[PDB]
Ligand binder design. Structure first.
Ligand SMILES: C[C@H](CC[C@@H](O)CCO)[C@H]1CC[C@H]2[C@@H]3CC[C@@H]4C[C@H](CC(C)(C)O)CC[C@]4(C)[C@H]3CC[C@]12C
Ligand SMILES: C[C@H](CC[C@@H](O)CCO)[C@H]1CC[C@H]2[C@@H]3CC[C@@H]4C[C@H](CC(C)(C)O)CC[C@]4(C)[C@H]3CC[C@]12C
Lengths: 10, 237, 237, 10
């Protein structure tokens, strides 16, 4: 879930 | 008179905004180009996707955001993102133009261009009235930046767990805002209240965007035109 | 001598290809512009996404594809899409240029530009050797189009249920292809076998693309740059 | 599943 968001949050 | 702790908060909020708002608008040439009733959806979706990244960069530098849970960070971003984009867009909105001047002539966004991306006047007239209402307030950049952080850090957002922690962060931001206005903003005795009213305006613009986004995302030949980050942030998932 | 039933198949395959291959390349200005080690990924992903739509339009007009189940159609498209794009791209590949001439100078794709989208020479050298091998065969457009349909209609693809039905469609396509070559292609006594060899080449290019796509899609700051249709068609989902 | 694909297939 929220793959990109988790990434951009470091 | 403002304390040093409150002073550092302002400094770091201003530094965070300057790192994530490119006044030269030179990334806009990267987007799928504009076309001038859905002719603007590819361009405007690349635009909003780029803006979402700037808001994530901004939020990651708010004092204490980094220390919330990943879940609380995601929840606050998914409900506030569209409001901070509308808010941060005020710096390129023009009262004379009634448009968003983002660099060259291809990125001057009139009300005509912005009605060509799936959304209607029920969203676009209020949003334009919001922009001129907010421009007319003539906020110091410190106030403008404080409001973005207060808006992001709202605990009355769907999905937040640590309500009391987020509320304490926002409270300390509001204290700084009221203090700054009193001491550094001449004739600002009413300005705190107006800004909070504009936050209410934002909630209403959010609902109407969400309602209309729903209609876009139910048409696969339209949602196809969005970006992965938009689909994830505005998704119900 | 070819029958009328076999003749209509050729006609409708040629008409299907002419509807879905734009020789003017005028949609390419819609894509996120090229930049000349991941500088080309936004542009090339918009490119491949556009091509996937043309392949879906092509497939929907193959005699009997429309009548398969939606599941069989999706399975055949998810495994063959990348192969038909490589195959249909031969019409703009140039032996003199070693490049894909797609209109203006911004859309001449050398081997340098195409190594700037996340994929490596392990994929790009074989793909280029495939293009010159296939160009050198000098296929009639009827043969080129028959091969695209035979490639799409392969029943030895992961996910297909009605094996026997898909196999019967492909068999009748192969009959038309061998018959056309014998009767209409001078000196083509070996050409059927070479074309089938090129289909094997395609299987190998597919595996290597899938392996490398996996590495892109596991990096969310790269898969973020793809389009919804790419993510869905090349996904494992 | 395959929302866009199902659509483009009519
Ligand atoms: C161009 C203009 C400002 C750009 C710059 O200042 C940089 C901002 O960070 C934006 C601001 C709000 C945007 C609208 C928000 C509401 C919807 C969102 C839609 C995105 C989506 C289709 C996913 O719903 C696209 C249409 C729109 C009306 C936006 C247009 C661009 C505006 C005015
Ligand atoms: C420009 C060129 C031809 C375009 C036109 O003839 C229209 C085609 O329908 C394409 C063909 C194969 C493409 C490569 C396929 C393998 C990968 C797919 C990647 C897409 C993705 C990142 C999702 O894996 C992007 C890089 C690439 C090497 C392609 C580059 C463009 C080519 C040569």
């Amino acid at each position: 879930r929220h793959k990109i968001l988790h990434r951009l949050l470091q | 008179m403002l304390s040093d702790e409150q002073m550092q908060i302002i400094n770091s909020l201003v530094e965070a905004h300057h790192k994530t708002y490119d006044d030269s608008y030179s990334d806009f040439v990267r987007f799928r180009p504009p076309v001038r009733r859905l002719s603007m959806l590819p361009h405007l979706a690349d635009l909003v996707s780029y803006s979402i990244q700037k808001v994530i960069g901004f939020a990651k530098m708010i004092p204490g955001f980094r220390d919330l849970t990943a879940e609380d960070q995601i929840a606050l971003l998914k409900s506030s993102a569209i409001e901070i984009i509308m808010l941060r867009s005020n710096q390129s909105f023009s009262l004379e133009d009634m448009s968003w001047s983002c660099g060259g002539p291809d990125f001057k966004y009139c009300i005509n261009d912005v009605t060509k991306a799936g959304h209607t006047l029920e969203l676009l007239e209020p949003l334009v009235k919001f922009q001129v209402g907010l421009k007319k307030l003539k906020l110091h950049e410190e106030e403008h930046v404080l409001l973005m952080a207060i808006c992001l850090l709202s605990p009355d957002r769907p999905g937040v767990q640590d309500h009391v922690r987020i509320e304490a962060l926002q409270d300390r931001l509001c204290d700084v805002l009221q203090a700054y206005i009193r001491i550094q903003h001449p004739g600002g005795r009413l300005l705190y209240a107006k800004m909070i009213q504009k936050l209410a305006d934002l909630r209403s613009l959010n609902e109407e965007h969400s309602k209309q986004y729903r209609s876009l995302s139910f048409q696969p030949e339209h949602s196809m035109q969005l970006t992965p980050l938009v689909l994830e942030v505005f998704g119900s998932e």
